RNA sequence: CGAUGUCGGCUCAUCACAUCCUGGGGCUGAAGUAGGUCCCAAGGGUAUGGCUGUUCGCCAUUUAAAGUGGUACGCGAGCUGGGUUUAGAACGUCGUGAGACAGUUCGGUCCCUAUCUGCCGUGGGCGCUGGAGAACUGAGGGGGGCUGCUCCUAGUACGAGAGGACCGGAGUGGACGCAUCACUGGUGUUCGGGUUGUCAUGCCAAUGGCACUGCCCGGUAGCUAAAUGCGGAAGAGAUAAGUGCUGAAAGCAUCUAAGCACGAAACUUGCCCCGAGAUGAGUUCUCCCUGACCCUUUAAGGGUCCUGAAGGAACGUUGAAGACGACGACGUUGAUAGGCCGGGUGUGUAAGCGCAGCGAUGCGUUGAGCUAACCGGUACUAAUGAACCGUGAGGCUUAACCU
RNA sequence: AAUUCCUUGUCGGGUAAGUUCCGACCUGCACGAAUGGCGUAAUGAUGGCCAGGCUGUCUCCACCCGAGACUCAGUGAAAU
RNA sequence: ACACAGGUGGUCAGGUAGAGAAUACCAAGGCGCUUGAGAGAACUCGGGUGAAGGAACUAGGCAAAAUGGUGCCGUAACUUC
RNA sequence: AGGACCGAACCGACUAAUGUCGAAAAAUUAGCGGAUGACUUGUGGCUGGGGGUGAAAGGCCAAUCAAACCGGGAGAUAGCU
């Protein structure tokens, strides 16, 4: 579970070192994001020869959260660092194509099916 | 349809083989014996009065024991009410057990919650909470304004001030009945059921299909 | 109780191994992708075990590809296929929650070798 | 945060008309001494249920 | 809310809760009866009684577990040899409670706690 | 003007339709998808920010939607004092000056123990006409009514094409609520271990007191959330705006004057808690009691003797009950509490000893010792035997039916 | 500008976005060289702003240790 | 005005940890506040905690929280040096 | 050496809360500054009301200061309560 203003990191290699969450999609006053949620971000730190820079309003999808995903049996999956992966503003189908760090199984639906192609694990 | 009564004996988990962990609830359904059947010609409406459990000798009184005496049934611990659904028929003394609920899929469980006590408005009605260190003084948790200025000149009836939270009677709905076990007399129904580990419950079939 | 406990022992599986905290177990979990009913495993460090019989579970921390996922498993559930210790560690604390705060060399334990 | 018209005497004791007290109404006696003492206490001289337990 | 919590708070901080019961159970053994309030002496029982089960089970070690508790060298010597095989016989409950009236000052309903003893 | 505290930010809301969204319908320059305006409709929902002294305003990004207006331009005997609106000070300016400014900058006490309405609750008296019991009906009065998004129907219908559907089904999310701890967590100055400096018990060892629990890492019961089950109808009645059929009056044309029909989140039902002090105080199955005796203004009478029922209460150990009471459980014709035993769980290798080693300390006995509340047994002590309050067949009038 | 009506003035950096702000254009409503002008590192219990560290101030609070709040008894006001 | 958390100037000034008289605990030497006893709710007051987050709160990082010591290594634009 | 530096006694009073029928006719508990000095303080004198003092607020002169406090003109004057 991650809500606004959070200095999240980014798991693929687009340019994004540390991004920040500002407007959590999908809900009319939804405060909370997670296991497959779509949040809206911008980059605060890039590499020099990245696709992106600091200062571009972008749309992402969470995978890691430091609170963890609830499995249907009662297993919890805690990481030690949040991550979301950058996409297009509207043609989502992500920018970056090599991801560091694993993911969890709860995306798995027809839109993010690249992420099991770029999964390193799970 | 008629409902039935027994205690509530805690919570556990029931594990399906695929890996779902249903957080389950146990309800111990005794013999539920019918004590008096009421009817339209003598009461204007028809229902039944049920009686359950075992109670000692030297506690039930002769105004109580007399209405037990007319059936030939034993000293139960209380007298509840269940309305007949105008089809099903019963007799005085007849026990009706947990295998009644064999073909139900959902039940409406109702009972008395815990007594949370004389609880604050932050706790009771979920008023949102103000500041606590900005220079604020002596209004850290209390509700605030309770009404408009001069022209109402009173308070409306029912404006959500603190009350002794809990212990009324709280009805939960659409509870998936999980398992109907007849031998150990234990009834298993999905979810979170009001009551303590031992209180009184009323479980009845769902009107909301 | 005795009433509800009698329900608890008729799905509780019979022989699990003993792990302490500080061991390096392998816990292979069941997982379903579409039609296939397959096996996936975990190679980490057990750092806490909470005993309540049917309600027991344990926290096994592996350092995966850049970060240390910390995953739990409810011990009597049908999701867990197998339990096998790789190496045993001589810890003193019973629920090591401070091994999220060490990485690399300091997060090694020892061997028990009792 | 003060009164505005004087309460009477008739509104006064009707707050006091629950302020009565209830003394004892039971006062059991001893098995040996037959002395008045409080129910489930001991006597002035020290008995309880036919037992001298003050050790005086 | 107090739902199935144990203990009496007895307005006193938590050092003063146990470390008073340090001394009253340190006084309950010497002359074996006292006079004190009802809601203290109803709480003195549950602390002076685990000094007894230790005292019917004698060793070097559990002598010191009743020295890590009540902290009187004469009481633990009065334990284990004067009390010990005096109540080593039967199952538990080594106290009598017979309530004993009211204070002259402030209606603090005093009670007697005494050991099940003194047939003299 | 012998006081009515003033913009604004919380918190708390509540009312009106001139409706921002949801629902119904008409019309179109309504092909479809989107729209536009006119009505019907107040049941519910009704952004976070950057900025600003903020309502006011802009942009960003959400949203099914971020409606508008009333309540001293709502709310200080509820809070904050940033705004102007005390005196200190300054820039500019106007005036010789003392000094003033819809001209800006800096700093500058917000008090009050609730008598009375009112409100969430909560107990006592006593009434309901003999008394008590336990259980209910239901007059009546609240709650609760939110809303996308994908898929199939069908890439269809309408369209050259791009595009792209209504009523209908399914599942998953958002927001508020209702519980519930079984898991995921937090809490656990009573717990088990570590440990800093110090003090004592004669000293080593071992322990305990003090230091914001001394500072620490974990932690049961419960208390609870972010944790997880449920909640908003489906169905019915009578009506809106409309849509009508068969027809009149006005031989024909007309949704209406007679009359018959659908038709909305609104209006009564449906579901849920309160509820016979519903003084119109009600039904229901019942349990308890049927001695003597003067007076009389013979009044629904007082009086004295003898008794004092079922039961309530009183005191008692107490309770997931609790502010004090109330309400629940039990009261030796005994499991109501504290205990003790079995265990669960927690913290994890007591103490002592033996040996290794110059030692700090390591290994064996030892996954030991210890454990607050929790779970299952046993009377070990403590929940006296009585007295107390309450009663002796229950006013009169009037038929139906019985002597 | 601590000097500014139009005024949130017009550009640029900062922010996703800036009536605050930092460097300037010059047309100062109404600066100005001892009712001192400009720059100035130290210095301030200074004014505005800003990232990091940081934490319950907040999103949305929940347990807990205690002194009163509450019950029983003793003494006992107050404005009004 | 009071047996009042408010002020009054010199002197003596012990042990062990510590730079020190501050602090932490004790010798000696004095005291326990002149209402107690229960209860274990909202509720202020003085606080210990804390899941994911990190100023989104707010007029304002005021308040909480954070850091913190004696040594060696090592440190800038500017500058009156 | 030094109106150096950090910091207790002592000095004071920048922030926050308690209080504001207060423990007190503006202090108390945590934090904030000078702390070898343009400092701080005890006893003892001098300055007296259009007068004093004053690193200047119109601040202060016995809990009261844009003109002290007690007495006396005096029962001032009161187009007004």
């Amino acid at each position: 579970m991650i809500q606004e203003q959070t200095m999240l990191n980014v798991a693929d290699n687009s340019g994004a070192r540390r991004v920040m969450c500002i407007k959590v999609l999908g809900g009319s006053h939804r405060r909370y994001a997670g296991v497959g949620d779509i949040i809206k971000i911008t980059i605060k730190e890039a590499i020099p020869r990245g696709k992106v820079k600091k200062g571009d309003v972008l749309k992402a999808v969470v995978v890691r959260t430091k609170k963890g995903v609830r499995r249907p049996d009662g297993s919890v999956i805690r990481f030690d660092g949040n991550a979301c992966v950058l996409l297009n503003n509207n043609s989502e189908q992500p920018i970056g194509t090599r991801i560091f760090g694993p993911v969890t199984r709860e995306l798995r639906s027809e839109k993010f099916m690249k992420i099991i192609s770029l999964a390193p694990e799970v | 349809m008629i409902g039935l009564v027994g205690k509530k004996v805690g919570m556990t988990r029931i594990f399906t083989e695929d890996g779902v962990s249903i957080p389950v609830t146990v309800i111990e359904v005794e013999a539920n014996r019918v004590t008096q059947v009421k009817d339209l010609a003598n009461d204007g409406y028809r229902a039944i009065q049920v009686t359950t459990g075992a109670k000692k000798a030297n506690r039930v009184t002769k105004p109580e024991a007399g209405h037990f005496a007319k059936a030939g049934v034993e000293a139960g611990r209380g007298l509840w009410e269940f309305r007949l659904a105008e089809g099903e028929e019963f007799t005085v003394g007849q026990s009706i057990s947990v295998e009644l609920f064999a073909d139900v899929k959902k039940v409406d469980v109702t009972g008395t919650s815990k007594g949370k006590g004389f609880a604050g408005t932050v706790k009771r009605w979920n008023f949102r909470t103000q500041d606590a260190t900005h220079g604020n003084s002596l209004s850290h948790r209390v509700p605030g304004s309770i009404g408009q200025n001069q022209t109402p000149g009173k308070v409306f009836k029912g404006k959500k001030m603190a009350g002794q939270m809990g212990n009324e009677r709280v009805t939960v709905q659409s509870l998936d009945v999980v398992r109907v076990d007849a031998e150990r007399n234990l009834l298993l129904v999905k979810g979170a059921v009001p009551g303590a580990t031992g209180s009184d419950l009323i479980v009845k079939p769902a009107v909301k299909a | 109780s005795n009433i509800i406990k009698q329900l608890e022992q008729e799905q509780m599986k019979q022989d699990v191994p003993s792990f302490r905290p500080g061991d390096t177990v392998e816990v292979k979990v069941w997982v379903v992708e579409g039609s296939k009913k397959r096996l996936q495993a975990f190679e980490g460090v057990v750092i806490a075990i909470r005993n309540r019989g049917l309600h027991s579970a344990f926290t096994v921390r592996k350092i995966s590809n850049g970060e240390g996922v910390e995953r739990v498993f409810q011990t009597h559930s049908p999701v867990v296929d197998s339990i096998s210790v790789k190496r045993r560690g001589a810890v003193r604390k019973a629920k090591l929650y401070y091994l999220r705060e060490r990485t690399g060399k300091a997060a090694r334990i020892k061997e028990r070798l009792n | 945060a003060v009164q505005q018209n004087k309460p009477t005497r008739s509104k006064r004791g009707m707050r006091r008309s629950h302020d009565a007290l209830t003394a004892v109404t039971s006062l059991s006696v001893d098995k040996t001494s037959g002395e008045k003492h409080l129910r489930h206490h001991i006597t002035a001289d020290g008995y309880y249920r036919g037992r001298k337990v003050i050790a005086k | 809310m107090r739902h199935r919590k144990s203990g009496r708070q007895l307005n006193r901080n938590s050092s003063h809760r146990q470390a008073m019961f340090r001394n009253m159970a340190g006084s309950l053994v010497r002359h074996e009866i006292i006079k004190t309030t009802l809601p203290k002496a109803k709480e003195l029982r549950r602390v002076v009684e685990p000094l007894i089960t230790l005292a019917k089970t004698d060793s070097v070690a559990n002598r010191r577990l009743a020295f890590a508790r009540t902290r009187d060298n004469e009481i633990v010597a009065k334990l284990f040899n004067e009390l010990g095989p005096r109540f080593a016989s039967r199952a538990g409950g080594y106290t009598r409670i017979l309530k004993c009236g009211f204070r002259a000052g402030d209606n603090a309903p005093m009670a007697y706690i005494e050991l099940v003893d003194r047939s003299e």
Side-chain angles (χ1 to χ4, degrees), chain C residues 37-94:
Chain C
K37 211 195 171 219
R38 83 173 210 104
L39 295 175
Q40 183 83 322
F42 202 104
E43 223 280 336
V45 175
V46 161
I47 43 176
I49 162 179
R50 181 209 143 204
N51 260 286
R52 317 274 170 86
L54 203 51
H55 303 338
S56 183
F58 54 94
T59 79
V60 42
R61 162 171 208 78
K62 82 178 296 193
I63 291 177
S64 296
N65 319 320
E67 67 271 60
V69 187
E70 177 191 321
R71 202 174 170 177
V72 85
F73 300 101
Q74 321 268 300
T75 310
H76 292 342
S77 157
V79 309
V80 50
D81 200 64
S82 46
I83 310 93
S84 158
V85 184
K86 303 291 103 178
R87 46 193 300 265
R88 47 188 203 186
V91 289
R92 283 297 298 268
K93 299 253 172 171

Side-chain angles (χ1 to χ4, degrees), chain C residues 3 9 11 13 25 29 40 50-51 61 75 78 80 86 95 103 106:
Chain C
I3 309 106
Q9 65 215 4
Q11 296 148 255
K13 81 187 56 177
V25 311
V29 75
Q40 183 83 322
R50 181 209 143 204
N51 260 286
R61 162 171 208 78
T75 310
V80 50
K86 303 291 103 178
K95 295 210 174 168
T103 53

Side-chain angles (χ1 to χ4, degrees), chain B residues 1-2 40 46-47 82-90:
Chain B
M1 208 75 42
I2 61 167
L40 269 80
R46 48 178 298 179
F82 289 116
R83 281 268 268 270
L84 312 170
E86 200 257 328
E88 51 187 352
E89 59 166 321
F90 295 101

Side-chain angles (χ1 to χ4, degrees), chain A residues 28-89:
Chain A
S28 318
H29 197 304
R30 169 187 198 153
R31 303 150 296 223
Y32 279 148
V35 321
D37 209 24
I38 47 173
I39 82 178
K40 194 69 68 69
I41 49 166
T42 183
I43 314 102
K44 307 304 170 144
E45 184 77 9
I47 86 160
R49 277 89 59 199
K51 285 203 172 34
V52 301
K53 64 164 180 60
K54 183 173 191 175
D56 327 82
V57 171
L58 285 188
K59 186 258 188 184
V61 46
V62 206
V63 278
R64 300 199 270 275
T65 179
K66 210 153 178 176
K67 180 54 169 48
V69 53
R70 269 281 276 183
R71 309 314 297 277
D73 62 344
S75 177
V76 67
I77 305 180
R78 262 183 322 275
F79 301 97
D80 209 6
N82 305 326
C84 66
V85 299
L86 274 169
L87 318 180
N88 185 265
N89 205 341

Side-chain angles (χ1 to χ4, degrees), chain E residues 43-76:
Chain E
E43 286 288 340
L44 180 51
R45 290 169 304 173
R46 215 208 51 244
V47 184
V48 67
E49 283 182 12
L51 288 146
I52 314 304
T53 71
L54 274 48
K56 53 97 186 175
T57 47
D58 306 341
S59 189
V60 177
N62 299 124
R63 285 276 185 103
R64 276 197 211 179
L65 206 76
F67 189 73
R69 291 181 173 96
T70 38
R71 300 272 311 176
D72 210 322
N73 219 5
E74 61 190 0
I75 294 309
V76 71

